[PDB]
């Protein structure tokens, strides 16, 4: 509860009580992510509960309230992994997973790829059971 106000005020940096696209972009630049205006607008739309155009503290509270472990979220992750999964089965090669994670879509580095494969392929095999991986998540 208390940390929510501090986190909300952390993005503020001006004490106006409201978060805007420019404010979030400046915070992201200070962090060092180098975002774009389209990404900023998409994020503001996705977190904006009412849709007025800015981010309010009640909206931030609602966004914190909605979280992981949702059945819909687990199903979405499962079917995304299935789409990545050829042969219609539940197994994908570690090399193929590494290649797709490091090239396709978002870019990842060697250390995070190694952590991902370590957390996924717990056993010493060339395949990863994404169902059990998601269940572990």
């Amino acid at each position: 509860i208390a940390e929510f106000k501090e986190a909300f005020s952390l993005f503020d940096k001006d004490g106006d009580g409201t978060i805007t696209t420019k404010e979030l972009g400046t915070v992201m630049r200070s962090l060092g992510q180098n975002p774009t205006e389209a990404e900023l607008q998409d994020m503001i739309n996705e977190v904006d509960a009412d849709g007025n155009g800015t981010i309010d503290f009640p909206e931030f509270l609602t966004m914190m309230a909605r979280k992981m472990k949702d059945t819909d979220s687990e199903e979405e992750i499962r079917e995304a992994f299935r789409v990545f999964d050829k042969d219609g089965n539940g197994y994908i090669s570690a090399a193929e997973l590494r290649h797709v994670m490091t090239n396709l879509g978002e870019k990842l580095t060697d250390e995070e790829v190694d952590e991902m494969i370590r957390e996924a392929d717990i056993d010493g095999d060339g395949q990863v059971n994404y169902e059990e991986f998601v269940q572990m998540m």
Partner: protein, 342 residues
């Protein structure tokens, strides 16, 4: 790999080999059903009992072998692993249907030999061809999509049936026909007639005799046959629109980046919980990082949902608004730079 190949050949047909295998199995089941009909015919039972028994033995052995090999091959997919995974696969309704048919046929042929089992099992085994549920799943999806209008139609039709049947029962309660039998002896008979008329069958066993009954039947028929035939049209239009949108869907190469982004954002959110991890590559700063990662996960999920869903005018207008805002911002930047220069 052979396990996966046999599982595909037995449950997820893809080639002419699997097609002809399933066609032969279905044809054998249909032949057995036809012979069961011939046996049920009173004049063609003695010459068909022996062949029915032999075909039943052959088919029960074949289906037992098929079920055993399917259970063995169900372990290819990761969802079915070990004893618990095999049990989870067997819990599926189709596997339950196959197991019930197998055990009932075995016990019937062990007991036997006049019995209704050797026919009802064929009736139920004609359902075995519906592998993967590619038919019932579609029907259930369409019914669940149209549930509101379907319930409205059912309720209106049932209420109209009840009211009109009662009115006709009041009209022709004492209308003796030519054959000296009460056409409407009770509200039960009147309701049977009402069901026949609304379903537009017209057996003719019960027909109104008085002019009040005839007029009421005519008016209610004209005003309720449409409602009791409405589900056919509703489901037909639903199927047509569904297949049109299916043929209008985007190609499967437009979902890969969205799935990649969703997986990456989910992994980032998962790793944010662990303090010492490789994800900390670009206290309060940690909270800001995890909040930003949560926002990225949400936007990635929304983008994936929009990409998976077929293209829509709302998607078009959203994308155009985004592009127009980008262009306006850049033109404003150029204008302010030019003003600064001059």
């Amino acid at each position: 790999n052979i396990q996966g190949r046999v599982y595909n050949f037995l449950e997820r047909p893809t080639g002419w080999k699997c097609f002809v295998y399933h066609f032969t199995v279905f044809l054998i089941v249909l032949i057995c059903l036809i012979f069961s009909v011939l046996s049920t015919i009173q004049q063609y039972n003695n010459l068909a009992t022996e062949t029915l028994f032999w075909m039943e033995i052959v088919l029960v052995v074949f289906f037992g072998a098929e079920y055993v090999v399917r259970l063995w091959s169900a372990g290819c997919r990761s969802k079915y692993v070990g004893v618990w995974g095999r049990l989870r696969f067997a819990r599926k309704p189709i596997s339950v249907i196959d197991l019930i048919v197998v055990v009932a046929s075995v016990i019937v042929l062990c007991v036997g030999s006049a019995i209704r089992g050797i026919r009802f099992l064929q009736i139920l085994r004609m359902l075995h061809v519906d592998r993967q549920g590619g038919t019932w799943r579609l029907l259930g999806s369409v019914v669940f999509i149209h549930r509101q209008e379907l319930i409205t139609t059912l309720y209106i039709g049932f209420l109209g049936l009840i009211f009109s049947s009662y009115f006709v029962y009041l009209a022709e309660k004492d209308a003796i026909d030519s054959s000296g039998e009460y056409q409407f002896g009770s509200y039960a008979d009147a309701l049977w007639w009402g069901v026949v008329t609304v379903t537009t069958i017209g057996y003719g066993d019960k027909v109104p005799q008085t002019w009040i009954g005839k007029t009421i039947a005519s008016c209610f028929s004209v005003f309720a046959i449409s409602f009791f035939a409405l589900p056919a049209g509703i489901l037909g239009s639903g199927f047509a629109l569904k297949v049109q949108q299916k043929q209008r869907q985007k190609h499967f190469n437009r979902q890969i980046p969205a799935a990649a982004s969703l997986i990456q954002t989910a992994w980032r959110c998962y790793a944010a919980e662990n303090p010492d991890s490789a994800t900390w590559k670009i206290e309060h700063h940690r909270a800001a990082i995890k909040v930003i990662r949560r926002m990225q996960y949400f936007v990635a999920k929304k983008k994936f949902q929009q990409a998976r869903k077929p293209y829509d005018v709302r998607d078009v207008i959203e994308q155009y608004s985004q592009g127009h805002l980008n262009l306006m911002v850049r033109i404003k930047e150029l204008q302010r730079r030019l003003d600064q220069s001059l």
